[PDB]
Design a binder for this molecule. Sequence first.
Ligand SMILES: CC(C)CCC[C@@H](C)CCC[C@@H](C)CCC[C@@H](C)CCOC[C@@H](CO)OCC[C@H](C)CCC[C@H](C)CCC[C@H](C)CCCC(C)C
Ligand SMILES: CC(C)CCC[C@@H](C)CCC[C@@H](C)CCC[C@@H](C)CCOC[C@@H](CO)OCC[C@H](C)CCC[C@H](C)CCC[C@H](C)CCCC(C)C
Ligand SMILES: CC(C)CCC[C@@H](C)CCC[C@@H](C)CCC[C@@H](C)CCOC[C@@H](CO)OCC[C@H](C)CCC[C@H](C)CCC[C@H](C)CCCC(C)C
Ligand SMILES: *C/C=C(C)/C=C/C=C(C)/C=C/C1=C(C)CCCC1(C)C
Ligand SMILES: *C/C=C(C)/C=C/C=C(C)/C=C/C1=C(C)CCCC1(C)C
Ligand SMILES: *C/C=C(C)/C=C/C=C(C)/C=C/C1=C(C)CCCC1(C)C
Ligand SMILES: CCCCCCCCCCCCCCC
Ligand SMILES: CCCCCCCCCCCCCCC
Ligand SMILES: CCCCCCCCCCCCCCC
Ligand SMILES: CCCCCCCCCCCCCCC
Ligand SMILES: CCCCCCCCCCCCCCC
Ligand SMILES: CCCCCCCCCCCCCCC
Ligand SMILES: CCCCCCCCCCCCCC
Ligand SMILES: CCCCCCCCCCCCCC
Ligand SMILES: CCCCCCCCCCCCC
Ligand SMILES: CCCCCCCCCCCCC
Ligand SMILES: CCCCCCCCCCCCC
Ligand SMILES: CCCCCCCCCCC
Ligand SMILES: CCCCCCCCCCC
Ligand SMILES: CCCCCCCCCCC
Ligand SMILES: CCCCCCCCCC
Ligand SMILES: CCCCCCCCCC
Ligand SMILES: CCCCCCCCCC
Ligand SMILES: CCCCCCCCC
Ligand SMILES: CCCCCCCCC
Ligand SMILES: CCCCCCCCC
Ligand SMILES: CCCCCCCC
Ligand SMILES: CCCCCCCC
Ligand SMILES: CCCCCCCC
Ligand SMILES: CCCCCCCC
Ligand SMILES: CCCCCCCC
Ligand SMILES: CCCCCCCC
Ligand SMILES: CCCCCCCC
Lengths: 231, 231, 231
Amino acid sequence: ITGRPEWIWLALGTALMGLGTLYFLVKGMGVSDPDAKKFYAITTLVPAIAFTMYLSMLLGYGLTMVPFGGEQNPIYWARYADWLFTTPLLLLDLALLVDADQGTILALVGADGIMIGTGLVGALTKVYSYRFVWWAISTAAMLYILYVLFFGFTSKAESMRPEVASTFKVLRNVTVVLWSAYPVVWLIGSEGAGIVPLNIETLLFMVLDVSAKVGFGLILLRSRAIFGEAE
Amino acid sequence: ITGRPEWIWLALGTALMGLGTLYFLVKGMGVSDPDAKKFYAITTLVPAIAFTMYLSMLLGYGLTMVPFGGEQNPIYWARYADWLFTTPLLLLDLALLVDADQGTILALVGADGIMIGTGLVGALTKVYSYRFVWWAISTAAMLYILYVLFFGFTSKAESMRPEVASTFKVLRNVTVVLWSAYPVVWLIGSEGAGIVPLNIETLLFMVLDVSAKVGFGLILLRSRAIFGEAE
Amino acid sequence: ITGRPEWIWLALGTALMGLGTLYFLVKGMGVSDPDAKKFYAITTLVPAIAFTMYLSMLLGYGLTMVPFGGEQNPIYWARYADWLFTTPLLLLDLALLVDADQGTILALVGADGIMIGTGLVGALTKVYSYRFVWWAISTAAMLYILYVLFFGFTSKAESMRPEVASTFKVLRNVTVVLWSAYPVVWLIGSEGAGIVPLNIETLLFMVLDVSAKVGFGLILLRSRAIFGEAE
Ligand SMILES: CC(C)CCC[C@@H](C)CCC[C@@H](C)CCC[C@@H](C)CCOC[C@@H](CO)OCC[C@H](C)CCC[C@H](C)CCC[C@H](C)CCCC(C)C
Ligand SMILES: CC(C)CCC[C@@H](C)CCC[C@@H](C)CCC[C@@H](C)CCOC[C@@H](CO)OCC[C@H](C)CCC[C@H](C)CCC[C@H](C)CCCC(C)C
Ligand SMILES: CC(C)CCC[C@@H](C)CCC[C@@H](C)CCC[C@@H](C)CCOC[C@@H](CO)OCC[C@H](C)CCC[C@H](C)CCC[C@H](C)CCCC(C)C
Ligand SMILES: *C/C=C(C)/C=C/C=C(C)/C=C/C1=C(C)CCCC1(C)C
Ligand SMILES: *C/C=C(C)/C=C/C=C(C)/C=C/C1=C(C)CCCC1(C)C
Ligand SMILES: *C/C=C(C)/C=C/C=C(C)/C=C/C1=C(C)CCCC1(C)C
Ligand SMILES: CCCCCCCCCCCCCCC
Ligand SMILES: CCCCCCCCCCCCCCC
Ligand SMILES: CCCCCCCCCCCCCCC
Ligand SMILES: CCCCCCCCCCCCCCC
Ligand SMILES: CCCCCCCCCCCCCCC
Ligand SMILES: CCCCCCCCCCCCCCC
Ligand SMILES: CCCCCCCCCCCCCC
Ligand SMILES: CCCCCCCCCCCCCC
Ligand SMILES: CCCCCCCCCCCCC
Ligand SMILES: CCCCCCCCCCCCC
Ligand SMILES: CCCCCCCCCCCCC
Ligand SMILES: CCCCCCCCCCC
Ligand SMILES: CCCCCCCCCCC
Ligand SMILES: CCCCCCCCCCC
Ligand SMILES: CCCCCCCCCC
Ligand SMILES: CCCCCCCCCC
Ligand SMILES: CCCCCCCCCC
Ligand SMILES: CCCCCCCCC
Ligand SMILES: CCCCCCCCC
Ligand SMILES: CCCCCCCCC
Ligand SMILES: CCCCCCCC
Ligand SMILES: CCCCCCCC
Ligand SMILES: CCCCCCCC
Ligand SMILES: CCCCCCCC
Ligand SMILES: CCCCCCCC
Ligand SMILES: CCCCCCCC
Ligand SMILES: CCCCCCCC
């Protein structure tokens, strides 16, 4: 484990995702509202999945070597197995908050799968220049997601209860800022141009992951928007 | 790329799926009917997924070598990753058109997963004679799907609006004819008996894919069956 | 095939899953109740999936070698591909029986995916002591599932029709007893401590699989709880 300088950030990430999972699990014990139960189930699964994948990276299972640039490059593939399941769950939290229609939910989840799937292909591609073709396709899929979150959901939240509109607006802004950083870290990190070393890259993804999952969840599960209007 | 004679058909397929995706995306911009939005989302995702997998084959990522018959045989595995997601989406288009019940939808999607999954196992199997055992199981799963589309959905469409009944009947006939060709191309192509060479096999799958996805989508999204009855 | 002593139990399992699939398929022909159709579709898919994965193990495709303990250990990875899809389908049978809320269904299916996913990682892990870390995480996920089936569903079934309450109680008890045996067989078998040899381990999993899928299905599909109350 300790033979890799980035191990400290993988261990911290593992701990923070595990602690986040347990807090949400305990906090959700005393909840019977069927609407609130939906948000607790979605939001608790997110850091639980991330916990297992951070642990796999810490123990060395989620790491492979990819030859490109005449070098064997360490690629943590477990990140994409994490994101494949956690990013659509996070979008479902937002879509259920605004009572989005089914067709829009399917478009979001499908574009998200394309985003993560093409990012994985780009991470494992051995022809250096082709890695950035996949990065560009994946980034186009992300821009579609961000467009929908702004010019489809925002207008839908305003016609909703005030507390669900204000909570959505906050979580929307958090998501757009944090998610946009991921393609940048990829491009300048060891998967892309190799400007930033792997140990610093790992620290950046850990800050982003914890903020986008545990920070996101703390804002959502403390809001009254997750409960139905009741007397 | 150009070192493979089949590259021209992979490049054409990539272009036609990309163009198809963009047309459906633009055409769906001016749509607010929640029913129509469902069909546009399903139908636009189909060629978008196929685009990415054709590109992976063009660039050489979606290709592996499988030893059988005393030879290293080029097997494009990316086809099955495509079909795993696009064939159930196409069946969902048909099932939603006739307002099929949930139990029937699950049976269709499950049989479809078995069809594609066993076809993938057959494509990667190293014992030559066993490849055709998997082909037979996969073909049995397809025949179940075709039976349901005829002796379960057809009777359901007649009790529906006339425009949804006539549109379903057309898309049903297109699907049964085109899908039935796939097991035949597999059997006589490089995955099976090896009668037809890979470059011709690739041309045939490209014609079938574009017809079953973009041609299918053009018929559906030009129909009024996708809109609810409104004044 | 016959070069492996466990082949006899893989062949028996294949036959019993295939026969089970055909019986459920025939029995479900004469069913039009939309509620009953749901249970028949879920319950017939379970042994059909298991059939294909037992066949892959029989023919040698679903087997790999994992080095640990200074030895190349035969690991049947196809079991986890089976369980990944069949265990959530079995939980869906139970959840639909008691009309569970959506949030609870998602929590069950998500915990089940974590259970199977971490068990697969543990089966393929090359550092011997780490294999049991994954076993423990997977077992914690199972205990969560069992808790929900007892202290969330049981109370919900009592407020239901008497026949659905008594049928659920029976299937609940069958599930908790049979599922609990799996982590024990893993721990003492070739994936874990290696006390029980592989051929005996394979026999035990076959008895458990057939009971948990075909036996489970025979109890459910003979009950009147799967039909709506009708005159
Ligand atoms: C509606 C939305 C959900 C739609 C989703 C969008 C999606 C279509 C976007 C594209 C996804 C696609 C790129 C997934 C590729 C997975 C692949 C990286 C797995 C590893 O295989 C890659 C190479 C080794 O580098 O295999 C070496 C050769 C091996 C012999 C490969 C044989 C196994 C194949 C991988 C079998 C295909 C399985 C499916 C891809 C499983 C789904 C994986 C997940 C990442 C989507
Ligand atoms: C309700 C419906 C959706 C049900 C679906 C029906 C489905 C059950 C039908 C059978 C599907 C099954 C054959 C999928 C097999 C995937 C497999 C080809 C992936 C590549 O692995 C094959 C060998 C190399 O040749 O791995 C070499 C050895 C490696 C060490 C393998 C270890 C990884 C395992 C593959 C882990 C299992 C992952 C799941 C199979 C992922 C789903 C893939 C998709 C193709 C279903
Ligand atoms: C809501 C719920 C459904 C959530 C589900 C819970 C889930 C997150 C729990 C953890 C699942 C995770 C451990 C799955 C790992 C699959 C992995 C074993 C496949 C084989 O790859 C392992 C190594 C060889 O030993 O690959 C060698 C290196 C290769 C180069 C690997 C590159 C391919 C990657 C495997 C791509 C990721 C694909 C996804 C993991 C596909 C889903 C598989 C299924 C088992 C979940
Ligand atoms: C909890 C994890 C989250 C919210 C991860 C989000 C990840 C992304 C938005 C990743 C995007 C990428 C691109 C847009 C292209 C480059 C490759 C990716 C996958 C890093
Ligand atoms: C857009 C792609 C489509 C509609 C693909 C359809 C593919 C099939 C219907 C494939 C069927 C197969 C068999 C029936 C057995 C032989 C292997 C397959 C997977 C080619
Ligand atoms: C039809 C198959 C069924 C119902 C299989 C159930 C399997 C389990 C409940 C497996 C559980 C495991 C653990 C709890 C940890 C050890 C590894 C597993 C996956 C065997
Ligand atoms: C979206 C965030 C990207 C900003 C990356 C900042 C990295 C600064 C760290 C110093 C770079 C290390 C280079 C010298 C080793
Ligand atoms: C009462 C609110 C705080 C509860 C404690 C939460 C502990 C989980 C770890 C959170 C750290 C990361 C927060 C986002 C920066
Ligand atoms: C379902 C369509 C299958 C028909 C295949 C027709 C192939 C004819 C092309 C000529 C065969 C090439 C053999 C000589 C190289
Ligand atoms: C107005 C209808 C035609 C629009 C142009 C569609 C261009 C997408 C490519 C379609 C070619 C394949 C059609 C099926 C044979
Ligand atoms: C949950 C069931 C686990 C019980 C396992 C009993 C196995 C007894 C078979 C004899 C053990 C073989 C050891 C000598 C070869
Ligand atoms: C009339 C009920 C029996 C029908 C025959 C079922 C045959 C399928 C194989 C069942 C054997 C396994 C039963 C569970 C132990
Ligand atoms: C194995 C991959 C299957 C999933 C394909 C994605 C489409 C799923 C459609 C689900 C239809 C709704 C069923 C109720
Ligand atoms: C990782 C594979 C999980 C999918 C298994 C297929 C069954 C899914 C059941 C979904 C139940 C409906 C939830 C609302
Ligand atoms: C185009 C939709 C408007 C909202 C999206 C904001 C774009 C942020 C740019 C992200 C940069 C990634 C490289
Ligand atoms: C048996 C259901 C009737 C409709 C299915 C038509 C069968 C077409 C044969 C396809 C040939 C594939 C080898
Ligand atoms: C803790 C929830 C109560 C019901 C679960 C029964 C636990 C059975 C123990 C299984 C042993 C697996 C190692
Ligand atoms: C080795 C660098 C080659 C540059 C390729 C950049 C491709 C980016 C595509 C974005 C449209
Ligand atoms: C090398 C050819 C061996 C023939 C096997 C055919 C199997 C087909 C099974 C269809 C029932
Ligand atoms: C080689 C045996 C090492 C023992 C590790 C046991 C780990 C079990 C963790 C359960 C909390
Ligand atoms: C609940 C605390 C979980 C912390 C265990 C993971 C941290 C790795 C320490 C080496
Ligand atoms: C929108 C046009 C997309 C065409 C790019 C793919 C074709 C491959 C050319 C080499
Ligand atoms: C319907 C009977 C299915 C039996 C075939 C599988 C058994 C393997 C025999 C070698
Ligand atoms: C993106 C930063 C999240 C901050 C988490 C703190 C929330 C406390 C209510
Ligand atoms: C299967 C052939 C499809 C033909 C596509 C043309 C549709 C234009 C309306
Ligand atoms: C767990 C044992 C199941 C027994 C199956 C027999 C059911 C006949 C109704
Ligand atoms: C009005 C809410 C502002 C939230 C933005 C937070 C950016 C990290
Ligand atoms: C909408 C604000 C985008 C912020 C992008 C930050 C990328 C590091
Ligand atoms: C009555 C519609 C006929 C459609 C069949 C088209 C076959 C390619
Ligand atoms: C229902 C007509 C089937 C046509 C099969 C064509 C196979 C090449
Ligand atoms: C295995 C075939 C079953 C025969 C019919 C059983 C009575 C519905
Ligand atoms: C009251 C029903 C008892 C069922 C338990 C069966 C254990 C195999
Ligand atoms: C609730 C009874 C548990 C039985 C466990 C059996 C494990 C072999």
